């Protein structure tokens, strides 16, 4: 109860309703090692929405990679979740998604973007809490970021997601 | 206090600040029977506002009717509540209000609208937590909705309120 | 924990993210006297932001004055706080700030505005929870408001802050 209430509070505190989400990941070094050790391979971000009563979404990241990026890259994925208002939304989900690793020197951000494969189960109306994630297995080489550079600063990185709202 | 905190959280989670409110009512059948049985004739929706510091409002619904619609219609009412910034607002409340029962096939929503009766106590600056509710006693026949149709889907209905912001 | 969670909830409830904040100060008479008695010289307002992930700011008011306004004026100051996303923001803080004491008769509001002194310690990237406050020592004579007039009504006053978003 108490713990479950704190959770709702944190989720409410991180949520946004305009399709733009910024995820600050503090304690980067520790989490990065917990991933390398396979103790905590992935981390989910809090949920965010395309509009006040729009699609519910979240991100999933592997600090030491997944799939073709395992052990060599930071893998970042987008997840369509079951939203409270899904019955009012058009399905399958078909909004362009842009994902970024922010350069804290704003000189060169890592960026990738994709248009949902309407035939994939990842974008159908959610039956479970979350649909199968999809995104960027090779989002960023562990060396480009992590190592040093300008992506990690004061032991934290910022991930940014932009869900295009065309048609909504 | 714990229970009181949960309530505030849930209210904050539902609040909107642009005059548009979508109220999803799950467990329709059960609440519908609680209404027919006379155990819980009415339900208040969480509060929403015309602006970040505007009028505070909520909805009141009778799943089995009230007044001229008792036992035959779904009665939907609008409620002007005592807001924390009422001293900065113009009174009496004078914004056009639109109420809707959403068709979950978007085939044809039930809609009605009204201009507040400036001389009614329902729209004067609140002295109590809530002014006397007013709205639509004959909003929707129990048969048009409930029965089946496209308003009730997966045992839930969606009510939508839109407060016109002209002059604010 | 319990009180900690309530505090978090109260903060979230008061925050805004568009650079506009309205601060309602109730129990004016009592707090006014506590300031006069030197028991509680100043009060801080809840935090608000320039954007969803922008600068974090709050206000600091002296109901019985501070500095050149001590004992004769209401002193109102602006505070740049350490925000969770300062790494992503440009420093020093350089947005125009407008502060107002609202006339609850909307006939004559007290207003002042300033463009940050970029060389000031008050606008550099925060090292501590709060930077040195800056603002209006002689914002409003204790007599103009307090005494009576239209600023204090039903034992409450409203302070409003508007942070210009040009460049953000």
UniProtKB/Swiss-Prot annotation, chains A, B, C:
The keyword Membrane does not apply. The lineage of its organism: Eukaryota, Metazoa, Chordata, Craniata, Vertebrata. The keyword Transferase applies. Phosphorylated at several serine residues within the first 128 amino acid residues. Undergoes both 'Lys-48'-linked and 'Lys-63'-linked polyubiquitination. Can be polyubiquitinated at several Lys residues via 'Lys-48'-linked ubiquitin chains in response to TNF signaling, leading to proteasomal degradation. Autoubiquitinated, leading to its subsequent proteasomal degradation. Polyubiquitinated by BIRC2 and SIAH2, leading to its subsequent proteasomal degradation. One of its GO terms (biological process) is signal transduction. The chain holds residues 334 to 501 of 501 of the full protein. GO terms for cellular component: CD40 receptor complex; cell cortex; cytoplasm; cytoplasmic side of plasma membrane; cytosol; IRE1-TRAF2-ASK1 complex; membrane raft; nucleoplasm. Homotrimer. Heterotrimer with TRAF1. Heterotrimer with TRAF3 (via TRAF domain). The domain containing the RING-type and the first TRAF-type zinc finger can also form homodimers (in vitro). Interacts with TNFRSF1B/TNFR2. Interacts with TNFRSF5/CD40. Interacts with TNFRSF4, TNFRSF7/CD27, TNFRSF8/CD30, TNFRSF9/CD137, TNFRSF11A/RANK, TNFRSF13B/TACI, TNFRSF14, TNFRSF16/NGFR, TNFRSF17/BCMA, TNFRSF18/AITR, TNFRSF19/TROY, TNFRSF19L/RELT and EDAR. Stimulation of TNF-alpha receptor TNFRSF1A leads to the formation of two distinct signaling complexes. Belongs to the TNF receptor-associated factor family. A subfamily. This is TNF receptor-associated factor 2. Residues 18-163 form the MATH domain. It is found in: Cytoplasm. Its main location: cytoplasm.
């Amino acid at each position: 109860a108490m713990a479950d209430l704190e959770q709702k509070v944190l989720e409410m505190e991180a949520s946004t309703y305009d399709g733009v989400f910024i995820w600050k990941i503090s304690d980067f070094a520790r989490k990065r090692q917990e991933a390398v050790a396979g103790r905590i391979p992935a981390i989910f971000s809090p949920a965010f929405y395309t509009s006040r009563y729009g699609y519910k979404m979240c991100l999933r990241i592997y600090l030491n990679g997944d799939g073709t990026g395992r052990g060599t890259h930071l893998s970042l994925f987008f997840v369509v979740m079951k939203g409270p208002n899904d019955a009012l939304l058009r399905w399958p989900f078909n909004q362009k998604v842009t994902l970024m690793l922010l350069d804290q020197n704003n000189r060169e951000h890592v960026i990738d973007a994709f248009r949902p494969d309407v035939t994939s189960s990842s974008f159908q109306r959610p039956v479970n809490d979350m649909n199968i994630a999809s995104g960027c297995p090779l989002f960023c080489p562990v060396s480009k970021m992590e190592a040093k550079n300008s992506y990690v600063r004061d032991d934290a990185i910022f991930i940014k997601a932009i869900v295009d709202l065309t048609g909504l």
